[PDB]
Every structure is written in C-alpha cells, then in structure tokens.
C-alpha cells in the first residue's frame, strides 16, 4: 500500500519544514533581493552558484549544504565543458528537482528542505529576473514576482501581495521585506543582492554599516 507510505513521508517532510525560519526573495529594479532570519554569523542560508545564479534555502543545514555543493560542482563542470555563457538557472533547477525526487522515493528519510533558484540578465542586456521553486518531492514551479518558504507562509504571502510595487528601489524593497517578515535590526538578519550592473559576478553581501544605513 504505497498510499500510506507516501502520505506518511509527505507528513514527515511537511512537519519538518513547518518548524523553521522563513526566507523571502523578491525582484527589484537592480535584480533579486534575499532576506533571511539567520542569527548565526557562521552558517549561511543564502549563497551563489555561478556568475548570475543565486541560491537560497530553508530547513536542515546539513542537507541544503550538500545540495549547494552539488550545484556548485555541476555549474563549474558545465561552464568548463562548453562556455561560461551557456549556464542557465533552469539547468540547475532541473538537476535539483531530479535529485530531490530521487531522494524522496528511494531513501529511507526524505529531505525537509525548500529550494529557490534566481537568475538575472547579463551585463549590457535587459531581461526580467527568473525565480524557481523546488519542493521536497521534486515539484518545480515558476514564480514571476516573489517566493516565500519556511514556516508559515500564508500571512507572509498576503502581506507581500499588498505592498509589492514593481520596479522599486533597494531601500524600499528592503523595507517591504522587513515589514513582511516582522508581521529586526542588524542582528538576526541576512541580506544578499544579485546586482545586474556588475561586470561579471553579480552576488554580494551587505552587512554592518551599509546594512544599518539602508535599514
């Protein structure tokens, strides 16, 4: 009776992901903005995969750490195989979905993680940012505006669907993100941005005095 087994595994994964912090990613005029509740200064829930691809997750650290390492390995191998301009976020999202789907069925314990992949345009080009969502069972979905994962999501989604204005600024988008997450000072916050005005590498972290002034 695979019905009971799949129901139990889905319940286990849902209960594992439910008791976790929330991560919010949204797109502004300069790219994508990642904000997470990370009191620890040594463990990071937001990172980069390639020159234009970003990584974000919520759940158990030892799982999405391995997922991030595998994604970085795949991106580097693919970039060296053909070219640096032939790497797209869709290829990484598909690999993540396949890996999670394989883990869910065969492995005794499923992964209690939620993944999001974001990409931006290259230098001197105009393109809308792309956001993808990958769940524990391997489902992949496309989100045009924002992705909310971790803990409860309905109130946060309803708060974000109200004050979200397209083509906003960094300070304004940060204010909306903090207000939505609150419903938090320099501490207990991790902020990263994918800047589309950079020559090659678009990922950079904002902490300390710059984060204090912006917030």
């Amino acid at each position: 009776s695979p019905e009971q087994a799949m129901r139990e595994r889905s319940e286990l994964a849902r209960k594992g992901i439910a008791r976790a912090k929330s991560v919010v990613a949204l797109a502004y005029a300069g790219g994508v903005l990642f904000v997470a509740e990370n009191p620890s200064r040594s463990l990071q829930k937001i990172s980069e995969l390639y020159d234009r691809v970003g990584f974000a997750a919520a759940g158990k650290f030892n799982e999405f750490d391995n997922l991030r390492r595998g994604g970085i390995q795949f991106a580097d191998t693919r970039g060296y195989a053909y070219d640096r301009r032939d790497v797209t976020g869709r290829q990484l999202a598909n690999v993540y979905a396949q890996t999670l789907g394989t883990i869910f069925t065969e492995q005794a314990k499923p992964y209690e993680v939620e993944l999001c992949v974001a990409e931006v345009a290259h230098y001197g080009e105009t393109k809308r940012p792309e956001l993808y969502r990958i769940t524990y069972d391997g489902s992949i979905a496309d989100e045009p505006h924002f992705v909310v994962m971790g803990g409860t999501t309905e109130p946060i989604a309803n708060a974000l669907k109200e004050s979200y204005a397209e083509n906003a600024s960094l300070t304004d988008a940060l204010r909306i993100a903090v207000a939505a997450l609150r419903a938090l000072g320099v501490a207990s916050l991790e902020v990263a941005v994918l800047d589309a005005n950079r020559p090659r590498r678009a990922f950079r972290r904002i902490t300390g005095s710059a984060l204090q002034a912006l917030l």
């Binding site: 990172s47 390492r69 970085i72 580097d76 060296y80």
Partner: protein, 222 residues
C-alpha cells in the same frame, strides 16, 4: 616567447611578447600570454601555445571553485602549492613534447608591510618553486638576455612607470638578441601587453602608454 616580471615599491608588473612560430615560419602576430588569474595574481606561461591557454583556464577555474566552496580565498602558499602540483602532473606530457613553463606574480594583502607585499615565484621542470629575492625574473627562450638587461637597468626603478619602462626595454633587448621573440611592430601597430598589480588590484595597461614607451626607446637607441 619571453615573459618578464619585476618588483617596484608598492606592487609588481608583468609583460610579454606577441609572437608565435612553427619552426622558422611566423604563424602568430597578436598572441596574448599574460592573464589575470584573480583580483591579486597574474600568471604567464611559456612554451607550447596550446598548453598555456588550457593551463591558465584550469588554474583560474580551480581557484574560483575553491573560493565558492569555502567562502574564503586561498592563501599565497596554497596557490603556490596548487600551481606546483599542476606543473608536476605534466611531466609525461613535457617529455612527449607538451611543455609549459609558468611564472607567477602577486600581491599579498595579509603582509605586515604594504610596501614589500609584491611576490615573484618561479618554477622548474621537476616541479620545484622558489621565491625571488633579487626583484626580477624572466622565462622563455630569450630569458637570459632579458635578465642580463634587468641586472643593469634595475637601479633606475622607483615606481610603476620606471618598472614598466625597464620591462619594455628588457623585452626589446630579448627580441633584439633572439629571433623567436617579436619586437615592436610600427608598421602594423602591435605592442607588448602588460599587467600592473597594486593594493587596489590587477589592472591591464592601456596600449597608448606602451606604444609611447616603445617609441621613446626606439628613438633613444637610434
């Protein structure tokens, strides 16, 4: 093929020629042999043209991969060890005719003295490495003439401009004494390429300054 590197107060400088040959026939006229590996290092490989392009690409990919995985850049000793391992792993290919002779120059941001943070590292066939303490080094088929020229010209180095001028003069002497090294091309407009590394990072030198220095040297030697 000749690549030179020297130290000046506040940074380092590197330069190379733009000629490739197949025996006695000229086949290349605008070959680039100096690359920027990361924000504070530059690499120049001499020997077979095909091997150098792959070597620099692999080295840069490895450094970037480690940086992305660990979140912290490698130290200078780690980079030297990785380059030495890469050189040592190509002994059979070198014996079969695919030989590469790299040269490394970088700026150490963790050094206590900011005015002596420039480093030049040379490698041998067996894979050993040594840190130069005299201030200059050269590799290639005309490295002896360039080194002899720098041995006499190093007393005039004071800043970046003096170092660049000395490097261009050494390349000119090497091209004068060696037929496999290409000198300045006034008819076509091809000049050696240079890279300067300082406390702010590694920046490519524009062609205008190199052309002006080459013209001044040619006028002086006329």
């Amino acid at each position: 093929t000749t690549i030179v590197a020297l130290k000046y107060p506040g940074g380092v400088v590197m330069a190379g020629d733009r000629r490739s040959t197949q025996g006695n026939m000229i086949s290349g006229r605008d070959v680039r042999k100096v690359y920027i590996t990361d924000d504070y290092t530059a690499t120049g490989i001499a020997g077979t043209a095909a091997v150098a392009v792959e070597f620099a690409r692999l080295y840069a990919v490895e450094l970037e991969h480690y940086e992305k995985l660990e979140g912290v850049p490698l130290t200078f000793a780690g980079k030297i060890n990785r380059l030495a391992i890469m050189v040592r792993g190509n002994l059979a290919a070198a014996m079969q005719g695919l030989l590469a002779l790299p040269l490394l120059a970088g700026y150490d941001i963790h050094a206590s003295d900011p005015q002596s943070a420039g480093r030049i590292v040379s490698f041998d066939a067996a894979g050993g490495w040594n840190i130069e303490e005299e201030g200059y080094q050269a590799v290639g088929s005309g490295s002896l003439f360039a080194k002899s020229s720098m041995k006499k010209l190093y007393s005039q180095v004071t800043d970046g401009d003096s170092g660049l001028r000395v490097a261009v003069e050494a390349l000119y002497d090497a091209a004068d004494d060696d037929s496999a090294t290409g000198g300045p091309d006034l008819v076509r407009g091809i000049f050696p390429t240079a890279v300067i590394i300082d406390a702010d990072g590694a920046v490519d030198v524009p062609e205008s300054r190199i052309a002006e220095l080459a013209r001044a040297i040619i006028e002086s030697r006329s």
